[PDB]
């Protein structure tokens, strides 16, 4: 609307070759690659944002007088179809969703 | 990096089936999404139809009976297939790549420099 | 669909000067709203998306504004590399749809 740039460069894609995730217990878990409703199979996909390499330009705009800040990768919790032990499972894990930055005192 | 090129015939007889490829380079096929644009001799930008990450299309209703948008992850390729050509297809056929800034903004960040196509006998 | 109109058509301005294009859209598509810069023989260059974000390697001197229905597009300090057919492009709902481009010269 007024916003001209971010003050954390960010990526967003499609995952379509996701294998493992940390579930919402902390454990990690193997991640199917195909779901299904009473009739079709899906092969499983995720949209990610995560924080470009640097971590920016320290974030943009920020008073460097009176703050050390940096750009950090946030998630977000996504249902997926999961392998627990022997039965699948349709649990909550964590998935790359923003960045944001983050400040500190000097 | 990041690279598009379209190709194809020049020249399409009308009634026939137009067909252009999209070679990429610099990201993966999976990830991100291709939208293939057309611009008529001197006129506007017209948005055909999209191939999302996951495989699902999307066409323009105004050529959707005739469009076929696919992708071969293997050769780092789109296709465009327009069934039924006419003189209202003659245009500078563009293949770009659409970028994302979260799922609030949408654009076409990246495109190829255009392949013209002309329907004649 | 969701139509853009583009004004004006056509402009010439002299180095230096203050530019404004607008862009109308049929129906409200809140800040879901591109521009791009298609230089004579080039493919259409991104240079603003939703609204008013600048992409990579945009001059200073080009801006954003607006929203729902009307949106505008500014060269502060018009340059002679800016010779070009400029388009808005509605990102709001399919099928994506752009303006008719406003054609801009330079009066030398």
């Known amino acids: 609307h007024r916003g001209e740039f971010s003050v954390c460069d960010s990526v967003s894609v499609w995952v379509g070759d996701k294998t493992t995730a940390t579930d919402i217990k902390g454990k990690e878990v193997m991640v199917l690659g195909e779901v299904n409703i009473n009739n079709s199979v899906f092969k499983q996909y995720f949209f990610e944002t995560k924080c470009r390499d640097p971590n920016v330009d320290g974030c943009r705009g920020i008073d460097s007088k009176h703050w050390n800040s940096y750009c950090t990768t946030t998630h977000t919790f996504v249902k997926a179809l999961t392998m627990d032990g022997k039965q699948a499972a349709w649990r909550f894990i964590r998935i790359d969703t923003a960045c944001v930055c983050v400040l500190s005192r000097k | 990096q990041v690279q598009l090129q379209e190709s194809g015939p020049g020249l399409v007889k009308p009634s026939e089936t137009l067909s252009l490829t999209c070679t990429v380079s610099?990201?993966?096929?999976?990830?991100?999404?291709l939208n293939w644009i057309r611009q008529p001799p001197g006129k506007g930008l017209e948005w055909i139809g999209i191939?999302?990450?996951?495989?699902?299309?999307d066409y323009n209703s105004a050529v959707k009976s005739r469009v076929t948008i696919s992708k071969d992850t293997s050769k780092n390729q789109f296709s465009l297939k327009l069934s039924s050509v006419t003189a209202a297809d003659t245009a500078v056929y563009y293949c770009?790549?659409?970028?994302?800034?979260?799922?609030?903004?949408?654009?076409?960040?990246?495109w190829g420099q255009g392949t013209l196509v002309t329907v004649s006998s | 669909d969701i139509q853009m109109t583009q004004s004006p058509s056509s402009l010439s301005a002299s180095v230096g000067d203050r530019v404004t294009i607008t862009c109308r859209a049929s129906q409200s598509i809140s800040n879901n709203l591109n521009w791009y810069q298609q230089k004579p023989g080039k493919a259409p260059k991104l240079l603003i998306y939703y609204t008013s974000r600048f992409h990579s390697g945009v001059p200073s001197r080009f801006s954003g504004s607006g929203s729902g229905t009307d949106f505008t597009f500014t060269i502060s300090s018009l340059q002679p590399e800016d010779i070009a057919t400029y388009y808005c492009?509605?990102?709001?709902?399919?099928?994506?749809?752009f303006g008719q481009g406003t054609k801009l010269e330079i009066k030398r």
């Open positions: 610099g990201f993966s096929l999976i990830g991100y999404d």
């Open positions: 492009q509605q990102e709001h709902t399919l099928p994506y749809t």
């Open positions: 191939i999302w990450g996951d495989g699902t299309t």
């Open positions: 770009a790549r659409g970028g994302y800034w979260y799922a609030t903004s949408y654009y076409f960040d990246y």
